[PDB]
Amino acid sequence: TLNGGITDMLTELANFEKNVSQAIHKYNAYRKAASVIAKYPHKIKSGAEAKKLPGVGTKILEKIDEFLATGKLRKLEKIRQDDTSSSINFLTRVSGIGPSAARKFVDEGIKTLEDLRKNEDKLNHHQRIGLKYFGDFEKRIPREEMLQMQDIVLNEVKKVDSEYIATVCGSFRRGAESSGDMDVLLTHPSFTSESTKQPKLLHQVVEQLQKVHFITDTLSKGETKFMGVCQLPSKNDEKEYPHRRIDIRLIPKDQYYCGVLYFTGSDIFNKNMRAHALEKGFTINEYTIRPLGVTGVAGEPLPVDSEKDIFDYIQWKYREPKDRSE
DNA sequence: CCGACTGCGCATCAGC
DNA sequence: GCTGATGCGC
DNA sequence: GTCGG
Ligand SMILES: Nc1ncnc2c1ncn2[C@H]1C[C@H](O)[C@@H](COP(=O)(O)OP(=O)(O)C(Br)(Br)P(=O)(O)O)O1
Ligand SMILES: [Cl-]
Ligand SMILES: [Cl-]
Ligand SMILES: [Mg+2]
Ligand code: NA
Ligand code: NA
Ligand code: NA
């Protein structure tokens, strides 16, 4: 990667602002600058050259100059030496522990994996599962395992009702050679924007995946969104596979294209594309694209027959999933 | 100079 | 219980 | 932290 030193710096700065400063717009500004620099096809020689790119302003250009001259950023060197920042950043690596809870735990003297492990009763259910699988959730998933997981999920969904359609999205659908988790978009003709003619549509699928011991834990679960934990089966004498995060999102079948656009991402790609829609007078979510009136009020959903239709409304050339990894 | 920054489901809690 | 934040992770 | 008007 051509500018990895710079993008790593900006990412660590983004994480500092989110986790410690609790400054969500600085976090997003740093992530935006990292993303645009990551796609820039030249090795950056100067902060001024970087400042040409949209999202790199004066302050990041200065940081880039410092990094290029010295190989480091004093601001980050000091953050790394600060105990409270160090503790908060570590605690937020547990799934379910965010900026707020991390800072509250540090106040209470809970500041290490050992402290968490002996204070399990101070964790909510999500945090408790996050701690249990702390090590596993740091491991990435090779695409070859994602293919096995996909096969299980699709076949088990088929056994519940052959009219379900499950689509693995996320980085997998963008063609990545490894993924951080598995994201599954689910549809069924009974659930549309017009009516829900069968209950428990998501529950049935989760239950079947639990039945065959693929889903092992639940982080949260409602009528349309499941977040939990899964594990591939292993063979005789073989070490067990790590536990993996799995998300399942049930979307109205007639809104599949907005939903698969959303769940394919990346997150920054969605953010960039939704920001462009707003400039063009539309708002995009995982359900619909709608015009915005002058009052800022969204209007009726526009018809959508493909992912490209959504690109067309906002006057973007279509981008294949493999080219949305921003 | 400064308002606006993508969008939302599920968990948790406060106030009534 | 309901309603409306706030937190969190997508 | 960045940027459009
Ligand atoms: N804040 C956000 N805003 C808009 N869309 C978002 C979003 N967060 C997530 N999405 C959309 C967009 C996103 O692609 C999808 C899945 O969210 P994952 O967190 O699983 O992201 P992924 O791409 O699968 C990665 Br590379 Br992080 P992996 O999980 O393989 O490590 O939900
Ligand atoms: Cl901010
Ligand atoms: Cl909508
Ligand atoms: Mg994912
Ligand atoms: Na710029
Ligand atoms: Na966390
Ligand atoms: Na996910």
Domain ranges of chain A: 3-82, 83-139, 140-262, 263-325
Task: Name the architecture of domain A83-139.
Answer: Orthogonal Bundle (1.10)
Q: How far is CA A92 from CA A32, A244, A247, in A?
A: 21, 18, 19
- CA-CA distance, A150 to A228, in Å (whole number)? 16
Q: Nearest 5°: phi and psi at A209? A: -65, -30
Ligand nearest to the CA of A260: 1
Please give the Cα distance from A288 to A273 (Å, whole number).
14
Residue A206 annotated as lining a ligand binding site: no
Closest-CA residue to A13 (of A69, A66, A49): A66
Cβ atoms of A291 and A281 closer than 8 Å: yes
Q: Are strands A244-250 and A182-187 parallel, antiparallel or unpaired?
A: parallel
Instruction: Let me know how long chain A is.
Output: 326
What is the b/e burial string over A121-141, where b = at least 16 CB atoms within 10 angstroms of the residue's CB?
A: eebeebbbbbbbbeeebeeeb
- Determine contact, residues A37/A3, Cβ cutoff 8 Å: yes
3-state secondary structure of A188: coil
Give CA–CA dist A180/A183, Å, rounded. Answer: 10
Contact A284, A310 (CB under 8 A): yes
Provide the 3-class DSSP secondary structure of residue A27: helix
A140-262 folds as Beta Polymerase; domain 2 (3.30.460)
- Resolution in angstroms comes to 2.0
The Cα–Cα gap between A166 and A251 comes to 10
Which ligand does the CA of A258 lie closest to? 3
Give residues with Cβ within 8 angstroms of A238, minimum separation 6.
none
Q: How many Cβ atoms are within 10 Å of A147's Cβ, its own excluded?
A: 11
How far away, in angstroms, is A170 Cα from ligand 3 center? 21
Q: Which nucleotides of C are covered by protein (CB under 7 A)?
A: 6-10
Give the CATH number of domain A3-82.
1.10.150.110
- CB contact burial A192-215 (16+ within 10 A = b; e otherwise): eeeeeeeeebbebbbebbeeeebb
Task: Give residues 80-99 of chain A lying near strand B (Cβ < 7 A).
Answer: none
SS3 (DSSP) at A161: coil
- Give the position, in ligand 1's atom list, of the atom nearest the Cα of A176: 30
| Opening angle at CA A314, ends A272 and A257, nearest 5 | 80
> Which amino acid is it at A30?
Y
The reply to whether A100 has its C-beta less than 7 Å from any atom of strand B is no
For chain A, where are the E strands, in sequence order?
Answer: 141-142, 165-168, 178-179, 182-187, 215-221, 225-230, 244-250, 282-284, 289-291
What are the start-end ranges of the H helices in A17-98?
24-39, 47-51, 58-70, 74-81, 83-91
**A63 belongs to the catalytic site:** yes
d(CA A304, ligand 3 centre) in Å: 13
